Amino acid sequence: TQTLPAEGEIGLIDVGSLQLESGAVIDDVCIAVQRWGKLSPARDNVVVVLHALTGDSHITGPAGPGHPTPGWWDGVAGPGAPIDTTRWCAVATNVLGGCRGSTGPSSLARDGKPWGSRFPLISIRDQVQADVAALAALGITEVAAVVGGSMGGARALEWVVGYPDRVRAGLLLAVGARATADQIGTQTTQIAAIKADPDWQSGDYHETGRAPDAGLRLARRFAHLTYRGEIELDTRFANHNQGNEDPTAGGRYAVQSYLEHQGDKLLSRFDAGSYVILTEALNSHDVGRGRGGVSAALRACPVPVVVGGITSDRLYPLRLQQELADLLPGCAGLRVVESVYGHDGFLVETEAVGELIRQTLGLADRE
Amino acid sequence: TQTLPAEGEIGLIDVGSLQLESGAVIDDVCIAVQRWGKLSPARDNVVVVLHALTGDSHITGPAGPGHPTPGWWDGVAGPGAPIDTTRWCAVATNVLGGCRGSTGPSSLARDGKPWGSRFPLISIRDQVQADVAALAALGITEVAAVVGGSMGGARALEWVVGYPDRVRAGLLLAVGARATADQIGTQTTQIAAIKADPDWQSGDYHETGRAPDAGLRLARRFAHLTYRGEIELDTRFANHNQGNEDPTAGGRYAVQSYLEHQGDKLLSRFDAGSYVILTEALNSHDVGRGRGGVSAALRACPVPVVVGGITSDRLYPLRLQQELADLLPGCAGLRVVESVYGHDGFLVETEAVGELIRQTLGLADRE
Numbered sequence: 031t032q033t034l035p036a037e038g039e040i041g042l043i044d045v046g047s048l049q050l051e052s053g054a055v056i057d058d059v060c061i062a063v064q065r066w067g068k069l070s071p072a073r074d075n076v077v078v079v080l081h082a083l084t085g086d087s088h089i090t091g092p093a094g095p096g097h098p099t100p101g102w103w104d105g106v107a108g109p110g111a112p113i114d115t116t117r118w119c120a121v122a123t124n125v126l127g128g129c130r131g132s133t134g135p136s137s138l139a140r141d142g143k144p145w146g147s148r149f150p151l152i153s154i155r156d157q158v159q160a161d162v163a164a165l166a167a168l169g170i171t172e173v174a175a176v177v178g179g180s181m182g183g184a185r186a187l188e189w190v191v192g193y194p195d196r197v198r199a200g201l202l203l204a205v206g207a208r209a210t211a212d213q214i215g216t217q218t219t220q221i222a223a224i225k226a227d228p229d230w231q232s233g234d235y236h237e238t239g240r241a242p243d244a245g246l247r248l249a250r251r252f253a254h255l256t257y258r259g260e261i262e263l264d265t266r267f268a269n270h271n272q273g274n275e276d277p278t279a280g281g282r283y284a285v286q287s288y289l290e291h292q293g294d295k296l297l298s299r300f301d302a303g304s305y306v307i308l309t310e311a312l313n314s315h316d317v318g319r320g321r322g323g324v325s326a327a328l329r330a331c332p333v334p335v336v337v338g339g340i341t342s343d344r345l346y347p348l349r350l351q352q353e354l355a356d357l358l359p360g361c362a363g364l365r366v367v368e369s370v371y372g373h374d375g376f377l378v379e380t381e382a383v384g385e386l387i388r389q390t391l392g393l394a395d396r397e
Numbered sequence: 398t399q400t401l402p403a404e405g406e407i408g409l410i411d412v413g414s415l416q417l418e419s420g421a422v423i424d425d426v427c428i429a430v431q432r433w434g435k436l437s438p439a440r441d442n443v444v445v446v447l448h449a450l451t452g453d454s455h456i457t458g459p460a461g462p463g464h465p466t467p468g469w470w471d472g473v474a475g476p477g478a479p480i481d482t483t484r485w486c487a488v489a490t491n492v493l494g495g496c497r498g499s500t501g502p503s504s505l506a507r508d509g510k511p512w513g514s515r516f517p518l519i520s521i522r523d524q525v526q527a528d529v530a531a532l533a534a535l536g537i538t539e540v541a542a543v544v545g546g547s548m549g550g551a552r553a554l555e556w557v558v559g560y561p562d563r564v565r566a567g568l569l570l571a572v573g574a575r576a577t578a579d580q581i582g583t584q585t586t587q588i589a590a591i592k593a594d595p596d597w598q599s600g601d602y603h604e605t606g607r608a609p610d611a612g613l614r615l616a617r618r619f620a621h622l623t624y625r626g627e628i629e630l631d632t633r634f635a636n637h638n639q640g641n642e643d644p645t646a647g648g649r650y651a652v653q654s655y656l657e658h659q660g661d662k663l664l665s666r667f668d669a670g671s672y673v674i675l676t677e678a679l680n681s682h683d684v685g686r687g688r689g690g691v692s693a694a695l696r697a698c699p700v701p702v703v704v705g706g707i708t709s710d711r712l713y714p715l716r717l718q719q720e721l722a723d724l725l726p727g728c729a730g731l732r733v734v735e736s737v738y739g740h741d742g743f744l745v746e747t748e749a750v751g752e753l754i755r756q757t758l759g760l761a762d763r764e
């Protein structure tokens with residue numbers, strides 16, 4: 031009924047009313063979409079690439095109009111790429127709750143004011159329901175494969191587990207069956223830092239001329255450290271000063287200065303309200319809720335999957351991927367991606383991760 | 398010339414004018430002190446116990462008047478204990494910059510107003526001058542052993558390296574030769590959260606009936622996570638809710654609630670200004686500064702030392718202890734403490750760490 035945008039261009043997909051897991055019903059849902067490669071005549075070659083916490087639909091490509099920075103996974107989709115677009119059609123949504131096209135706290139409700147504090151808490155499962163609805167509105171009812179890391183891997187997991195009849199294979203990268211105590215710990219506190227900012231104004235700051243920037247920068251600095259590998263950070267920055275500043279007289283250390291920059295980079299492209307809603311959705315992640323626990327749910331999922339984890343990951347430790355490999359019968363065994371870059375390793379080790387993308391897409395073609 | 402307090406009792410030791418590494422001078426410095434076990438006639442059996450970031454002079458004993466909670470290393474010193482007070486004199490200060498007896502931002506400056514924003518930045522090396530000044534004020538000019546973990550291990554490494562002829566052995570536990578990028582990263586951001594609180598008031602909140610409690614609570618919650626082990630936390634809390642609260646309708650998870658209490662516990666006994674000043678001193682930690690670098694400094698230190706590190710420590714990883722073991726000729730080899738409790742492991746694994754305390758005092762006997 032509706033059509034994929036032209037390659038590279040964004041389209042907004044009207045999915046209508048959506049009933050969340052909470053029972054609430056959200057009106058006028060809109061999901062931003064982008065694609066690379068041609069949609070095959072059977073519409074059976076879609077590879078959904080699922081972004082992480084602050085990502086959007088712009089997975090690959092250079093900076094341009096409407097896109098201040100290159101794709102967050104630059105190079106993963108294209109001619110000859112791991113997601114080879116001469117044979118596959120890489121589709122990437124902007125997740126429900128986001129702030130780059132899709133319906134989120136920053137978006138305008140049917141009363142003309144921004145959703146703000148009225149946006150309901152949503153789950154990873156809601157986010158997967160929204161994407162499936164959107165692919166439906168475009169006439170795509172089965173996907174060849176899902177690929178994702180971090181939150182995107184959580185989306186991938188809930189996709190393959192909840193819709194096994196409508197996905198042929200999955201690649202789950204640096205993710206676990208549920209939220210860990212440590213993740214919830216850092217993540218709930220990140221939310222607290224934003225909410226403690228006085229300009230938070232209960233989440234209804236949009237269009238007031240004040241925003242919770244101090245809190246959002248705090249959240250991003252602490253979060254960024256979880257994404258890194260301890261040694262690599264020490265090797266890059268150590269206890270060196272930033273340029274010619276002296277910390278003993280109020281200047282900054284190099285790693286400190288860097289973290290500040292990471293926060294400014296986020297402020298110029300991201301909305302505090304979405305940071306809260308999506309982190310809440312991370313906290314609630316649990317593939318076993320309502321289906322007998324993690325083991326029961328995974329043991330029942332027959333979808334073939336490739337599971338990869340990073341050796342140096344401090345936020346989603348390898349043990350969590352081993353658990354997924356252990357429990358999912360469609361998984362041949364854990365694939366260990368060797369990397370010094372911690373959680374961000376799955377975006378950095380392009381060759382090692384490419385192999386997993388190829389094996390994952392190979393499995394979608396066997397069926 | 399001044400008196401050792403009674404066993405258990407706090408005493409306040411006037412050390413007078415103290416000149417910091419910056420050249421600045423603080424007048425009327427006071428170091429709170431406590432001791433357990435009897436001081437020998439030669440005054441040669443002192444075992445200095447150095448507390449970590451939030452610690453005080455109350456290393457052992459139960460809660461009582463002036464001590465709302467038992468000592469931070471309850472049990473480490475006593476008859477037959479690792480620090481055997483029938484033979485050793487266990488002395489513990491409150492570090493310069495603290496808020497439990499010694500001169501810190503919360504202390505009253507000579508003008509009758511709190512030091513506050515006027516308290517100067519200090520180093521681990523400064524903290525050691527003040528401790529050495531206090532013991533001198535008591536007629537103690539040489540210690541037998543220095544024992545510490547975390548910030549107290551940096552106080553013990555700067556003591557063994559800077560006062561090499563006035564200490565006979567050292568126990569360096571869960572510490573490194575300098576601050577790591579990761580440590581500086583989390584720690585500067587913790588300071589940033591305190592300073593972003595509106596009630597911080599440039600550090601001069603002390604007599605204004607409002608204080609930066611939200612920021613100090615944010616700092617402690619993030620810090621607390623670094624002291625824990627990822628697995629034990631997940632085993633303890635998982636993604637369980639707190640009691641009967643529903644996070645999907647505004648409730649808290651069990652770990653989230655736990656972290657909230659950790660912050661409440663700190664507020665009722667600790668000063669935000671000291672948190673800031675003391676974290677600065679942590680960032681400035683660098684045993685090689687002014688001595689030609691870490692290797693040069695350690696290679697030149699002949700003091701017998703024991704070095705222990707915790708396998709699961711996420712704030713001061715085992716690699717940092719291996720470096721100390723590698724470089725100090727007085728170290729026979731890294732002693733690895735097996736523990737699932739992360740950084741807090743050195744206070745928990747009482748037999749394993751106590752075993753090492755005995756080894757250190759054993760070395761002080763030999764010498």
Ligand SMILES: N[C@@H](CCO)C(=O)O
Binds near residue numbers: 082083084085373374
């Ligand atoms: N892309 C998300 C997750 C990164 O691992 C973010 O930047 O926060």
Ligand SMILES: N[C@@H](CCO)C(=O)O
Binds near residue numbers: 451
């Ligand atoms: N918990 C200690 C740090 C080392 O565990 C303190 O803050 O005093």
